Symmetry: D2
Subunit: 242 residues, 4 copies
């Protein structure tokens, strides 16, 4: 007995009513979702935080039956950094409760308030982290991480940013294997990165979540980068028994 | 460059935050979308009026390119009347300005305010109409209508209500033919009906539209019927559909 | 446990190896599947017979579990008759056993051998009949028909031929309702026909069936028309414990 | 103006005529496609090679229009080895011309006849390689690799085999960026591997190609492992795929 919800934005459009935008999020004339503040020149600013949600909650689990949804989302994104040596803070795909407020900037990625684990967050996220928060146990490498009610990622893998180049991303969740899987590929320069782990979405998330993007820039001048999104598809399936 | 927005409600849930319940519209505990009001008794009430819309506007055409969405939807619904001789007024699947407010009850079907045509409605519907308003040029028989900016359907055809029986609808809009088609089947009765006509969606809708059901029961006590929706499926693409593949399992 | 097989021919190409063509059927330069003989000049010929099948069998029902496929097919076809008053014989979408040869021409539609019902035809069809075979209890009008192990339709509805316009067809089988529905629209005329009936696929087909088209022109001189298909899409779904 | 062709085998079934079996490929009565010979015990035999292709050719590209197909494919497979430390040879998913004979075994994986690259193979493969063949430039570790007309990969990455555990694979081709990607995840060990390269196909493969799997065991006793496939979906679009939807509908 399956519900499904899916959409594909191959462009973005100014003021799109199917998209909830938060903090600094703009969608440009040219169709770019500009998650984080970027002046006329292309020049990203500090002290920024931006978010994008799909306008309707996704039913990721069902308490009557205990059935859990599988989902798959795909997106393409570009991090340009004026200076690659100083980069902060990163972007992320997440699933948080609905009407849940944006949270601290920088390392927090606009999804947390603190280094502390808290089951209250009810956030699961795949981060693309570009600055090392030693305070958070970040690997020293810029990384893909999987967060579960904590910015202190449960598992991380290296990810070598290709500055200004477009990354194609696939994020997967098999509900019967409880497997969350994230893969990033640079089409131009042909590199590849994968991270996978087990997350039991029912003990973590509410039945209904907002899905979308979060992004932050550095708390320090020069520690700046864009977080531009070009396209985004998603598809979730919630079957009620076998 | 193709956008797609799409979904399946095969079962409904109370309070479902991805739909916008308006008027009396609710979803019971066992999953039925009651568009229009029903006592626990199971007795349908008069002067009810309810709508359900998907909470996400749909991009139906793009002004910059001129490009227009194709779309498909299907659902399963029952109208049950305690008294088949006194049945009012109907239900409808529609597109309208985001997220439109319900308009007059009764034979207006929550979609219109009078018998006259008006472009500001910006509304296009397929009605499944159950009471003959002669001031709306209604045919004597129960009928499926296509309606554009008016309650006076621009084309109707016969529909024989099977009282208390689930009908399966496929409504369909091929953008290159500007073709709207509504098919209705009762699998229990083996009976079927189709209406087909053109409507140039770009002429009559805004770029963004809210999609849903609308239903009303009668303006006099006893003209009464349910307008229950069991399941619902929708799919659109806008390029700046694969229908076979869409039904066989949406 | 759901298997699925699906495709779309948005146009045909000559000797494309995923169709098997039988009889006179061929694919033209401009990508048309002419089921029946049309000459040099567009003049269709009599005594012609053509079938075009998907080169893969379709698992219609599973005997071990007794479950049965749902499937949906859509196609676009033109028949054009140079004399509207003298047209024959029709076309058909059908399911039948594999390596099951073409069968009698004319009014049997490449699908049968006599008037009589016969179980061992193991054939199910939706037909688009342009000539009254009185001998087959044909209605006195061009009709659409459901046929199950007989050219004697188990049900019909009136179909109004629109000479030389493309017809859009949607045929659909719902194995939970055991419900076969055929709809035909002409975009040009705005016209619309539907036929709906119960058919037990599990009763009348084997587990695997070829799926395709059959068509035939009239017997006598003059009872001629074309039977041209432009596009075809099929999808089926066979869940073992649904 | 877009063609399509997809399927999903969640089970395999004995004899299944939409699947063409070559060499030793057997489908177990419990549903496993056994690419290479697996005896009574369940003990894999050496000296084996098997292949299973989809029974109909796939249109990968069109010469008239020069347009080229995109495609996803996923599958579950298990390699079981009685001694983890004597293992050969490997399995692959390939695209070769119809109706390609199966070719040399062992480290050639049933796809190639020798170390030599050849254009007239018109074979592209994603390889799962379990034995180092120095004659083919194999890296010291077990690896996934992209093969184009040759048993010598154009690129590889360390694949660490988890013995007896189902691997889930995703293979994609983006014709728009001539880019082929293989990824494998062992859901039990939460462990993963991904491999990206550019390969044209228009220049390398015919318009029509058969597709499936190929496998082989070692050339000497004891160098043995199974190559068992549990499910398989495939999707191809060629305009003259929405992967996110593909995966979650398998
Ligand atoms: C529904 O479908 C089946 C087809 O599967 C028909 O049954 C078959 O009919 C054929 C043709 O009549 C029979 O073949 C016969 O088999 C015997 C040996 O078993 C042959 O020798 C025989 O030939 C003799 O007759 C010939 C013509 O008279 C000569 O040329 C030969 O010399 C030879 O002397 C012929 O090939 C099948 O055996 C029969 N199959 C089965 C499984 O029964 C149905 O036909 C009906 O039933 C038949 C028994 C027969 O009596 C027909 O007259 C019936 O139509 C067919 N049913 C209907 C209603 O059409
Ligand atoms: C579409 O619906 C709109 C809004 O309902 C119609 O506009 C209304 O039309 C009436 C004209 O018959 C107007 O009557 C007036 O009432 C006011 C006081 O409230 C008086 O001061 C005035 O003397 C009129 O009698 C009404 O004003 C008007 N409402 C609004 C909000 O403008 C509309 O009718 C069409 O446009 C309007 C503005 C007039 O020009 C009409 O003549 C015209 O037909 C509806 N359109 C159609 C095509 O039916
Ligand atoms: C790469 O792949 C091509 C195509 O298979 C190879 O060419 C083929 O080689 C075969 C010999 O190994 C040729 O077949 C023989 O033809 C003669 C003449 O009738 C027969 O008497 C004999 O018994 C064989 O059937 C085959 O003709 C040829 N195929 C084609 C399509 O031309 C190719 O091998 C190289 O080219 C040929 C001309 C011979 O010189 C070979 O020795 C040769 O290596 C393969 N390339 C390599 C480097 O291995
Ligand atoms: C978690 O969050 C809530 C409010 O958001 C707070 O009351 C609580 O103290 C939190 N921290 C921990 C460690 O539980
Ligand atoms: Ca960090
Ligand atoms: Ca009415
Ligand atoms: Ca006839
Ligand atoms: Ca090797
Ligand atoms: Mn981190
Ligand atoms: Mn009406
Ligand atoms: Mn007939
Ligand atoms: Mn290798």
């Amino acid at each position: 007995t399956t519900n499904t919800d899916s959409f594909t934005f191959s462009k973005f459009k100014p003021n799109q009513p199917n998209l909830k935008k938060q903090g600094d999020a703009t969608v440009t004339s040219s169709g770019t979702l500009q998650l984080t503040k970027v002046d006329k020149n292309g020049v990203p600013d500090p002290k920024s935080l931006g978010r994008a949600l799909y306008a309707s909650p996704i039913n990721i689990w069902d308490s009557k039956t205990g059935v859990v949804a599988s989902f798959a989302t795909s997106f393409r994104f570009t991090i340009y950094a004026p200076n690659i040596a100083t980069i902060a803070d990163g972007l992320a795909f997440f699933l948080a409760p609905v009407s849940s407020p944006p949270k601290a900037g920088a390392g927090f990625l606009g999804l947390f308030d603190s280094a502390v684990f808290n089951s209250s967050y009810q956030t699961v996220a795949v981060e693309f982290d570009t600055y090392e928060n030693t305070v958070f146990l970040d690997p020293p490498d810029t990384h893909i991480g999987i967060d579960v009610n904590s910015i202190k990622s449960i598992k991380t893998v290296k990810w070598d940013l290709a500055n200004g180049e477009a990354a194609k991303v696939l994020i997967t969740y098999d509900s019967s294997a409880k497997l969350l899987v994230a893969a990033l590929v640079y089409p131009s320069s042909k590199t590849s990165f994968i991270l996978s782990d087990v997350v039991d979405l029912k003990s973590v998330l509410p039945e209904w979540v907002s899905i979308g993007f979060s992004a932050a820039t550095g708390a320090s001048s020069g520690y700046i980068e864009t977080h531009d999104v070009f396209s985004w598809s998603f598809a979730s399936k919630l079957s009620f028994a076998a």
